[PDB]
Design a protein around this ligand. Structure first.
Ligand SMILES: [Mg+2]
Ligand SMILES: [Mg+2]
Ligand SMILES: [Mg+2]
Ligand SMILES: [Mg+2]
Ligand SMILES: [Mg+2]
Ligand SMILES: [Mg+2]
Lengths: 219, 219, 219, 219, 219, 219
């Protein structure tokens, strides 16, 4: 069960220590890049990616919640991103072109669906993804209501992968915590994007927080 | 001669130490908040403001390079901003409304003009500003060509203040460094927004960097 | 067979009398709120809703043909709306958030599909709707050509409700008149939004108009 | 001193009586048409204009607070508008074209400036206007703070008219009431757009309301 | 096997001769009309259509890669277009209205899907199309990578036509050349839009070019 | 008196001959590149520039009537443009950046104002222009009403050049014909952009057309 900490939830006062801890414990760094337009909020950016790059060995995954993802691929590659997760709802008319550009920069391809987007949306290019993520909450902020209906999406995504003989990992984004770990794993999740409720909030010290989270995942 | 370090140019690995140093040496924290639309880039956000707030006593100045500044005033106030610098080119039809909202949150008012916007743009509300900033480079990125033509704008802004008996501070944003300190002061600048070329770049250690910059300002 | 008169088709000269008549004869007040952007036209608004509220006991249903439905929920609730009908094509990325906000204001949830949007568009939240409406004409104006192809959508919507054990009412919007009553009922319609051709136009006096309409529905 | 009642402030329950009263007492009908985009609100529309047309002899003045005024000229002419008031900030690149279209429909030309727009904005076509209006409040809603700074704009507009030998009427829009009548007349206003605070609010009965307003204008 | 030369790939120096040759050899003239917004590029326009009209008898097919197809139907009809090919992704909320407008102008209806749009997108109006085109490359430019995944779309489109008893022609747009002729025909293609790689590039002289292409189609 | 033929008005049937004639008789090729958004129309594009480049020695001047001029500079340079004429109303926040990019491509800088934009709009960078053009008609189409008011703009532009000791050429765009030649020269025009009414329309044969135009300019 892979872990991907949401950096928009970290403590910048302990930036260096938290990144180093995460780099030696987690599987991915989840970096949210918002537009203020595709979603009503602003969080991280290439600048943040560039800084995390200084002490990272694990892959930096940039979730592009922006209107024009085409504008950030080259810039994000230079900042040190390893994964570029695209929203199918922002790439109609350019999905293949962008996926090629992403790989031309030696980065991996991620696809992320918000609540109301069906998996078929990616049917013609789902086989080009290394990881597919399911928003279990409408995008934009931390601490929003979990959307149970998304469990079926996780399952459908798992069945699709098996039936088509694909190898993409299934990730979950949105209120991944003690109240949802079980259902999510049962549904088919391979990766957990953990934020404030699932990690950082358990202890002011990240070691203790991670230990607590790890213990809770046990069940 | 007041100083306002551009935080999008800081080193997050030494976040806590750099903020504390800046808080006891500078006059303002310059926090750039970009849209990806008003300017083609993404840098800081309310989240960032919130983190800097943890150890700040000096005022946090949020430069709103966004299409809809109305969407960030309440959120920025809650994150701990003290100054909200508005672009006149984004408030036609709502300048007075926003200025009132800014003060209802007990924050100071800043006005910032990019290169091609004349000072008259603010003629009907220039007297409500605590600080007026002049972009000496087209907004968006660090390390762009200085625009000499902007010197007249700084001067005009100083003459306007005197002639109208106003008290706003005149700030400069864009390539403030050894090559421009003199001309800028002569033109009428009161505050220097210092970034990579003017500060951070002089020494890996911020104390030493600040010493070098201060020395260069001497001339 | 429930009736919902389209108020953008009423006679303001007899505002008070028509609203009172409608309030004691119809099941819903259909209030169209257009953007000028989502659809190329402008009709009613919160102001209108507020006025109708003065003498209404039946529920006011606000059909949001706007780009940003999020901007009107609180304002419409305040004006007295009881139903907020959302276009699935304007809520991708915020359907669950908005549906929660609507209920937080004690209003009922409506979902409306224009001609080219399939029912699956609502598959993950169709069970949260009190009423689902089918546009039988491209949105925007009154008196446009009926779209027969929409009959299958009404049917599919009825089969879906039965198969999933749901209780939403099925509404029809667009050229509901003598020429379509039969087919619409046969297809599965529960509610008729009646405008100029189906109601108001039959007689300058609304009692007589309603009488004629009721008689025509008989067949 | 001409009067132009803001219809978005009227009582629809007494639609017919208020329009008839206004038609025989006022000089213009002020009809606000909003986009939800140019200004954050929705009020009246062509439908509304069409209804007022049924009993009007005085000119219907449609204030276009919309992003694309070009989309409403033919439709508004068709609904019965007599005046089309354009926002200079929405016609750059098409002012002359639109002014010609307005006159090709036999309608008069109005120009309206919001707070932060200087009179020079209209310098190349100011001589084509029958009436020029000054927003004394940021556009969008009723009951907002009066903007004293706008008095100079009214004056400048009067001086311009005299100096250039023009004949346009000067109108005021925004918090025209007892607290501002005097200053506005002194500044140069020819027409008062009266809303809730200046008219409708004085008495539930419009005759009495109008009587009180007229008396207050006396001073 | 019908041919439709992409005019954005022709040689304007030999305009008259190439159009005349094409008019007596091809089945359609493929005229690309781009927005700079729907796709990131600009190519042909009504002006171009008008010129080709001077010597054409074969139908001019205008592929509308624009944000607002509604703005070009009357103008294109006037310039002499015979076919208007619409993108389903630009007509939600107005497909039936536009299709009717196209036919009021006595023009034929075309529907074109870019890579990531499924055929169901047109399910409610697919029967109104004379020709349906499949983009085998993300729209915008010539010489992009062929998308094999689109072969299934061509097939599905053929099965749909048979199963529903429809008569639309199936067209292919994007890298139609020697490397793809076979697979495309096998998949179900009826018409080939030929550009630089498939036609013009084979010989500076268009007769010779057309010969080479025809020979390659043989296999 | 320099001449710049508007190619959107040429005859493509005689493409090669007209370009060659123009290349040996005119001073510039005026190539209009429209967005469909900045102005409501579509005309020429990089493709067109590329073709004219095949037989041109005189400079190709691309007038960018587009929302995002930044998207076309590299592409246009590649196609062979020599002049890039920018609209000040589309470069606020990037005028200096774009002007630098234009020169990095070894192209000359043009600035074009539509009717309602004052010359001051360019005050901070007017000295970087090789040619400044005045629209004497709202942009978008050929054959629109001449705007006399623009004569003052031409004059002001000439006075500005003299007073500031600049060397830019003054160009006129819009209904340059027999009815306006005199006034335009008197006002200060240095270059005439000639279209259908001023050139092409005088004779089906371009030699004769040019002959007639040249003679009319004599007066
Ligand atoms: Mg995320
Ligand atoms: Mg800044
Ligand atoms: Mg409706
Ligand atoms: Mg108004
Ligand atoms: Mg094409
Ligand atoms: Mg031009």
């Amino acid at each position: 069960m892979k872990i991907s900490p949401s950096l928009m939830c970290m403590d910048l006062l302990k930036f260096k220590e938290q990144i180093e801890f995460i780099d030696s414990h987690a599987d991915y760094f989840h970096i949210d890049i918002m537009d203020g337009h595709f979603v009503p909020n602003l969080t991280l950016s290439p600048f943040f990616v560039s800084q995390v790059k200084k002490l990272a060995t694990k892959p930096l995954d940039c979730h592009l919640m922006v209107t024009r993802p085409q504008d950030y691929i080259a810039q994000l590659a230079r900042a040190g991103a390893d994964f570029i997760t695209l929203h199918p709802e922002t790439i109609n008319g350019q999905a293949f072109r962008l996926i090629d550009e992403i790989r031309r920069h030696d980065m991996k391809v991620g696809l992320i669906l918000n609540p109301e987007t069906p998996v078929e949306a990616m049917k013609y290019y789902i086989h080009k993804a290394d990881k597919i993520t399911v928003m279990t909450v409408d995008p934009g902020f931390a601490g929003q209501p979990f959307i149970p209906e998304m469990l079926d999406k996780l399952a459908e995504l798992k069945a699709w992968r098996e039936r088509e003989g694909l190898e993409y990992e299934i990730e979950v984004d949105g209120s991944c915590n003690q109240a949802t770990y079980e259902k999510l794993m049962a549904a088919g999740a391979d990766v957990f994007i953990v934020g404030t409720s699932g990690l950082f909030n358990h202890a002011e010290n990240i070691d203790e927080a991670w230990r607590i989270m790890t213990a809770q995942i046990l069940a």
